[model samples]
Target chain A: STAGKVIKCKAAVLWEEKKPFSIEEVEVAPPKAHEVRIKMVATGICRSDDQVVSGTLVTPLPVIAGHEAAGIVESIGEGVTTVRPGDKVIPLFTPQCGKCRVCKHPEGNFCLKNDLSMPRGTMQDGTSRFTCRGKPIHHFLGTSTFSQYTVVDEISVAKIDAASPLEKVCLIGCGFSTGYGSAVKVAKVTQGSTCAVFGLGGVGLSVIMGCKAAGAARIIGVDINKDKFAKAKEVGATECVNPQDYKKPIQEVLTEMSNGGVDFSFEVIGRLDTMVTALSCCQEAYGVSVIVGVPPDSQNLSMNPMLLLSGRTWKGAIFGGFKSKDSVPKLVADFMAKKFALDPLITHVLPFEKINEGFDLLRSGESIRTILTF
Target chain B: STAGKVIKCKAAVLWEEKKPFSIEEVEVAPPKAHEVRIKMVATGICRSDDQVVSGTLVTPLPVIAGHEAAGIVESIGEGVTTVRPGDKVIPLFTPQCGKCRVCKHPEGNFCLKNDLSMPRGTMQDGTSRFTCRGKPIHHFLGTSTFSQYTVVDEISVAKIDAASPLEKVCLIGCGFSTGYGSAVKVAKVTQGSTCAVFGLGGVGLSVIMGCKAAGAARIIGVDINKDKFAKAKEVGATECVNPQDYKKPIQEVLTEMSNGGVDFSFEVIGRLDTMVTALSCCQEAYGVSVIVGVPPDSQNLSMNPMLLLSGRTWKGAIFGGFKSKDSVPKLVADFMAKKFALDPLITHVLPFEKINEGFDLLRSGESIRTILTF
Candidate 1:
């Protein structure tokens, strides 16, 4: 697995909050111990990145910003044996060390030690390995792959086959995982069950795919944009509704469309209005609303207590309900198996040098996922 | 086990909300299917009974006043096997059939079926079995036992040993079961936990007992009446504080006493100001305050949503957390096994003829539990 040397890299860095992405040349140190240096081939632009960039999802500023990335391993650190150098890999937003309590549990993506330290903007050792201009820069959620090359903890990378395009696989690193896992794992969408998804963005589209994969017959997509109807239908959304176009209350139309209410409803767009609507559109007694979107920090989600007390549940899903190491590769395998694939969802791919082009496309909502490839 | 024919009985009835109790003669029918008729021996005058009289806990007009009573079964209707004729039993304010989903679940107490039907003042079959002067009278919680006799569904009665005093045991049918269970069962107050209980009445005092039972190190009873503090201490409260004495804000006192905030706090007075004090006297995080007192029908609970997200919880308790049929018998056993050690909590007892006299003392705050012996 030792097949490498220190690599010089070019990176797009955010030196301050609410600033445009700036390109610069930088040195990537060789992995020291239990670490792997990745030559990132592709990274996808995700909304959470935008939220962080917009100061909505606050973090320590003047840092690298990408987390949804797929790449090739250039070097292996001492004592690292999970992957060989020159192997194709994807970076998981959440790392699975396998030895942690959550990794050992059956339905765990919430590893404790790493997750507890995540909010503090430091690694487990309470130090940042990254620096610029002789000043230590805070990490943003561990896997910051905006740069062309970077070193990471071994647990952060999952090996995948090199033959498949890295740009397409990059989608599975975040948005795809969140949406798919919200339905498949969180809701466990049963065969012949009904589901309704609010907002048909990248996350909602992925949920649509997962619903179909799980055998849901009635998958209703609600969004303000009528153009999303066909795209949602292409990804296994059986029915669609324009939430802004409804004459009566959305609940009345939703109830009429689904016969009662959908068994499961997910709000991928994290506005409080949509969250309340998503909860109301679920079935009377046993329906559950899965919250997957990250709302703005200043907003509060308000609903009547009587609503939750009368047989409804509200749960939050992080990382698409998958153990990063265990399910990320399986998702790639599923993609290969022709089981509700994500290739239909990826609209564009750009060179890694054209990363700003991908970010622009993502901001316009014209592209589901614009992959920036090396 | 049938030991008697149909019996006529004298019952205390309330003609209108907020009216004084009036005695009336009523016909008692033999038990029907899944029903058991009880020859009433003794009953507890609960705070909720006074609520019916004060128009705070509204019920169907011309309904009986007492819901907490203990008696010997006089007869069982066909197919009734839950209790035998002449068996001592405690009548449940709310029944746990132990068959419904909520009753079967260890974490929940509210049975789905009866919890749905109990408020209508009619039995499961939608007919009133009690009548005064041949005019049908609605039963209060299916146990109109303020009379010489009463009938109840087999599911609503928990059989207890005959040696136990019916008067004291009857109180456990509702108040003791609710307050004690709220601590041991609902809140699950751990050992050495600190608690702050507001309103040192019957239910509040029982919560004090439950805190003592659970091995809590400090129980600060907060009330306006300084006189009630002695009884509160007798029931194992570690310290007492009068709101009138502590001109400082209740939250400040609580935070100072608990070194941050009390782990658990409770509201036993239905007043809005007292409820706010109970909620405020909790820690900034990981504090849980229970709402046990019945608020007026028009009152709504108000709190900031941020409190809940910070690991603070506000919940309403019914029946002191007892799974009625399942836990009431055990509570009765605990009562008698303590060599009636719980009797110190009972401040007064009166005959059925002096039921009004008990209410006088309750209003004067001189009695904790005033039982009525038939």
Candidate 2:
């Protein structure tokens, strides 16, 4: 018996790793118990999407690739009450099942129901919702917004205000929230503090915005590529740096520039070495380094334990410390309130047919965030 | 022209690395400004001292190698007012100049004046106070409690109750304080939490006692040697495991035993692998791993950043997070109040003549703490 009602739709499908997404017609199934179906409006290109496609992030083959997206709820299944059809929503890569023990904790955004295994890539009941050419395709981060219509667990979709623009709020689904929450919620960046943002990509720039919002006096943005500096500064980075300009290590450069070290630092480049640099380039006593980048599975960060022993803290987060369903909606409202900037971050916008160009823009570091519109 | 009033004394001086200490007569200088001279009553043998002698911990040779000592102040340096002659005190390996930013901060115990460089075994003024055969003998860890009469910076000593026994209080100078403060201050281990202690030496056992005092429900003691299990139990461990008994990694063993992992873990063995294990064996969300051991300079602790990203934290502590002059005396008062166990940790006591034997016992792992009486 079928788990839910099914619908036919178009999607960017990855039949294999390290290959361009193939635009294909696929069957989108209706939401199962505690699941909802969403009609995708806008999705932002993220580095993790590139990583998954390039095999840097391990995932099942034949998958739909986008998680940073805003959409409208088209249908809901049995026992679903959080949202209903026609509701504006954002699909969460990190879900918040309000009933789980982890979801109840103030410190965690992880939910027991948010199954990570990509093999079964199906709904919580263990069945595929999308099929292409009669073969099943796996879900990507439980929020495959690359598809024209996607099935998501009820807990993984936040009901945002209808007044908020879907195209702009889509950025909040992942990158914006991840970087914003990292500074505001995770690091709790204090007023008049110093901060360094490593990588001028979408999350890094978003972190600068978050730091500025937290009243940081000096927000320095570090990147090997100098071209991203303009957008970085426009989004509240007080200073921009190209680490290649210095002969010393990036941490040393940052330490010297900040008199000792920044009060807070963020690693958004996804490189193990950069993670180390971000951690080492913090003030000895009250400095905190938040890892926002996703490191490769094979890579291990090595450092002298003396760094943490000397009163610096190294921690990481998935989704910037926001409890997805619970906090994402309020962030959308904050976005509407003009609390931070997201316009300059959207460097490139393209139609769904030109989605591969978005990936190319991300790969070339020419785009902070490239939005793909259906 | 003298930095301090010079005096003559006997000290256990290491003439060279990887060799036994030799008891010899040496000239001790009077304390310079902000310095004090102490007549040591008792000292404890710590692994760090053995590390210095074995060349594991890099330090200048011909150094007096004791830091964990309780003594009577014999003379005060010019302009020194923190303590007077005849005051009972413990020489702090981790000094606290309350004026420094780090010392004033609630998060760190490290003092700015406690410069780590073992340059010529000198004080912060960059001069030595001890000499033998007309050549200067370097100070070790700013305290050099191995000497019967040793000069120390006034900031590097904590005055304790005169009624407290010097022999037992000496242990509080380093190992006990480091372990106890790690739990109480650094980890802030909550009541009813589960904890794991790696390497059941003095620091590890002391961590168990601290965890027990914090009302930890399950204190699992891990050590390669099974002989330490009984002593570990007497102190506070509810369970004990020798890593050799498990076929898998110690992290996996503890993880499985604790039904996921312990809420807190402490690594007291100065091995990189155990440090990694200690970090990995903590519960995923809010599990804190505190590095209480000092790894060799040549070694580095490496791990997947995913361990921290998945809601775990990795931190290290020095002198157990106690502000030397301010907090050490309170801990001594706590010891007097029977708030924690310490007597059981002192497995052996030997006169200063058998000091090398104390080192031998420490090397053999046969003693938790070997008290050296002068």
Candidate 3:
């Protein structure tokens, strides 16, 4: 069961900036107090992994990468109460301690235990559970799901239903859920309301799915890549537009087409320019704009406050505004209930040894999602 | 009631910038095709009036400026259906034209037919209804309420209850409605949440009343003036704090006191500093910061994208995000039903003859609502 023994397993490790993930056999130690060790079955390649490894995002070196993973609990530390060995689970990058302020708050979904609040590499006690090349390697966000075996605090694990398939449901751990919740939970995309989803990637396409489910009218999918329009159209987008299709700025094009602007606008491409355009495409009054893409934290955004002064709302949340452990079960159950899966959403599946190739597909921006099985 | 005929009236008109209002006889003309002429009973001296008075906010010269007003419809134009002769009403600077995109949208409140969309100093038809010194005099916003008679587009007038007192309800025309709906309609302040209202002015006090009505737990009033704190609790404030009294940043003080920060923070002083300050005081990941205060036209707000990526919300609204045509009657009815106490709102009442001195008291920040009555 590997309950009390060290598991030497293969994992993707980033040792240097702009370097391809190095496949290394690392010693993943037994779970410390309040810790959980998960045996990863499948992990989906996400843009966030590339965003960090490309040197755009700063994180501790020699870290395991990947958060969109579905796995099984292999072992638990002394104080672990949430899960036992063999529990079907997904590691939460945004960890929520039920005792924390945000965990108990109504509007809050991001927890204080998240990596954004502390460091992206270390456990709560400031040490990594991974040892490789005669030195300790770091954790990625909270999950470090690129590993065959990864350790996390008990608070950072979500137990899913046993019936769920770890292969396709792995996408649910990140892109699908992140985009879905941005539309349904945060913006509460209302019935018959006009909405525009920018990027047309896995995330924004998922946003289109959310809009359709929420009964939103005229789901306009805006992307520079016309190739992705088919998937967006297939996933309930009533109209697809490319920025190159018009002489005017995309915002003006959307504004004129929707009679004013879309009631809700979403940005899923991790670019500030797209984020601002999404905001501009929102109706001048009573329009809500949400940012779902993870941009480099070092960058800043500037805007005329008049944008808001005219009665527009600008907001965003991590992991699609879910309270982690509380939301994943229902989301997985929905998958089991034939609600949604990665039929058109998942573009490719690769072996864990080719993790770098999966990231290449994401970096070239050609695939929706590329899942890697261990 | 006067209709179709031009009448001579004394109005507080500004002939030049930096000059006080000159109470002179002006020719008030008949209502246009879709206009309603109102005979003013009372008007409140708000800071918005002073914004134009001090040359900070530019307006057309020889303009009659007063948006916070109560009046009776003396006559209706050819297509006017919302109001008629002897109907009690309040003028809306932010109009609600039912046919416009914003007016038809479910969440939209700021209708397209507003002064901000056009010029702040004209009727809808590009012609003034006033003549002073044999020259066409400009209107201030939709209502030139400083005059004994004023005309507005049918979309810009909200019909209030017949039994409502014009003297006090004048404040309801602007400040009360602007701040009150900000909490209820815009932010939708939830029950048992902690809130902080920056700048304990009349509008900020109104925000507190709304938060209290919405069942907020800790209503902290923030101001530089300790004097406003007494009036703060008179409405509904759990506690009061002054920025001047704190050695640390006001946001840090607020964060430390509330264990994080308030769920909602309202910027009411119309200063960019206070707006940013209130935003900083909002709780991370879920706090909603509303900018109700009008900012200087010259400056733009810039910030690290992390401010919002941290999961806080930044939003703002005009006329408190109320669809003026519909919400005003209910607010007036609520006031008629004793839902709010307006006596605490009015600090001074001046006759029409002492309008200049009333403005002087407002400039000194010594009065809340200085009702300049006819």
Which candidate gets the maximum lDDT versus the true structure?
Answer: 3
Native contacts kept, each candidate: 0.01, 0.60, 0.81
Candidate 3 residue B230 C-alpha distance from true site, Å: 1.7
Native-referenced TM-scores of chain A, all candidate models = 0.93, 0.96, 0.98
Sorted on DockQ, best first, the list reads 3, 2, 1
> Which digits, one per residue and each the tens of the lDDT, describe model 2 over residues A227-315?
99988888889989888898899899999998878889999989999999999999776678988888885678788886876667788
Q: What iRMS does model 1 reach?
A: 6.5
DockQ of predicted candidate 3 = 0.69
- lDDT per residue (tens digit) for residues B176-264 in model 2: 98888888788888898889999899988888888988889999999989999999999889989998997899899888988777889
Q: Any residue pairs clashing in model 3, and if so which?
A: none
lDDT of 3 by residue, A159-226 (tens): 88988899988888889999999999988999998999998888898899889989998899988889
Per-candidate TM vs. native? 0.66, 0.96, 0.96
Give the range where candidate 3 chain A is weakest over 10 consecutive residues by summed lDDT. Answer: A295-304
Error of 3 at A240 (Å): 2.0
- Worst lDDT run of 10 residues, candidate 2 chain B, spans B112-121
- Where does candidate 2 clash, by residue pair? B5-B30, B6-B30, B7-B28, B121-B139, B178-B320
Clashing pairs in 1: B178-B319, B178-B320
Off by over 4 Å in 2: A1-5, A99-101, A115-120, B1-5, B117-120
- Of 1 and 2, the candidate ranking higher by DockQ: 2
Alpha-carbon RMSD, candidate 2:
2.4
Candidate 3: misplaced stretches above 4 Å? B55-59
